[PDB]
Amino acid sequence: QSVDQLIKARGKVYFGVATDQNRLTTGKNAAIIQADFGMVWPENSMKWDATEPSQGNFNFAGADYLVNWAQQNGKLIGGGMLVWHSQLPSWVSSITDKNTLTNVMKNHITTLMTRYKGKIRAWDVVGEAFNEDGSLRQTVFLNVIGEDYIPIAFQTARAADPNAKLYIMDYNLDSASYPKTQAIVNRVKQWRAAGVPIDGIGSQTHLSAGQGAGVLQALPLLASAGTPEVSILMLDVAGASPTDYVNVVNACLNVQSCVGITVFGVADPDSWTTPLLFDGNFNPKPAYNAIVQDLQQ
Ligand SMILES: O=[N+]([O-])c1ccc2nn[nH]c2c1
């Protein structure tokens, strides 16, 4: 059975998966994605290192491949990460001038979003902008542009493609008692009150064993920021316990603004702790069956 079809029948938009050309050309990834997932996200092909490895010299081959594959197979598409401190070319981090970096960041956002205009359901505009204590991570963007880099990124993205849902995403938003979760909520509330177009908070849900339970409280907390949408993304779970996976699914089911869930790959050997839903033989694991059973009605 298809977790995407079943979650849609529960009123959600999609059950998605991260992938890219190297997965879709090998093994059973394409067949599993065709059958079981309604949205694809690029594991790497839309990050800054892949798409703009030297300034103004864009490489769209991998991103084009994924977008084309998705359209041919009837899948929704997400993109990202537009602004991130990891996988960032040295030519970017070497910039110390505010105007220069602002213009570079805007051009990077606008170029990618314009190329795929109208084809992308949601973009991860800014990723991993928070320290664990809830302060803002001191990246080149923060240090050179200042705190306005987040407003600027979102305003630029909205102008480039107003069809897309614009997300901020972060990890360790899995417990309501951890400072980072309330901190991003507070800053997103404030940004939106200032007119910044943040449509979504995406929770990069990389769990250890037993951490699914806390998501039942953390995801409603994220939704209290008042964004149009929240989502689970890059989901994986060390040990792949059905209990942890079912808890995350139920958290999304319980939150009206949660639009869907994306799992961080297909088969365990291709994971970034056997933490995915398909084994090395590309067979569904107990956690996959448990999600199916939970979503059936
Ligand atoms: O939901 N995802 O797994 C996922 C993977 C790669 C991404 N890049 N930007 N957003 C992403 C989400």
Author numbering: 4 to 275, 279 to 303
Can you list sentences taken from the study reporting this PDB entry?
Although the first-generation HG3 design is significantly more efficient than an “off-the-shelf” catalyst like bovine serum albumin, its specific activity was further increased 200-fold over 17 rounds of mutagenesis and screening. All HG3 variants have an inactive conformational sub-state, rooted in the original protein scaffold, which was gradually supplanted with a catalytically competent sub-state as evolution progressed.
Increased ordering of the Met172 and Met237 side chains, which interact with one face of the TSA and likely stabilize the charge delocalized transition state through London dispersion forces, illustrates this trend. Although relatively flexible in HG3, Met172 becomes better ordered in HG3.7 due to shortening of residue 84 through the M84C mutation, which enabled a stabilizing interaction between the terminal methyl group of Met172 and the π-face of Trp87. The resulting conformation helps to position the catalytic base (Asp127), which samples many unreactive conformations in HG3, in a single orientation with the geometry required for proton abstraction. In principle, Lys50 in HG3 could act as an effective oxyanion stabilizer and constrain the ligand in a reactive pose, but its side chain points away and forms a hydrogen bond with Gln90 instead.
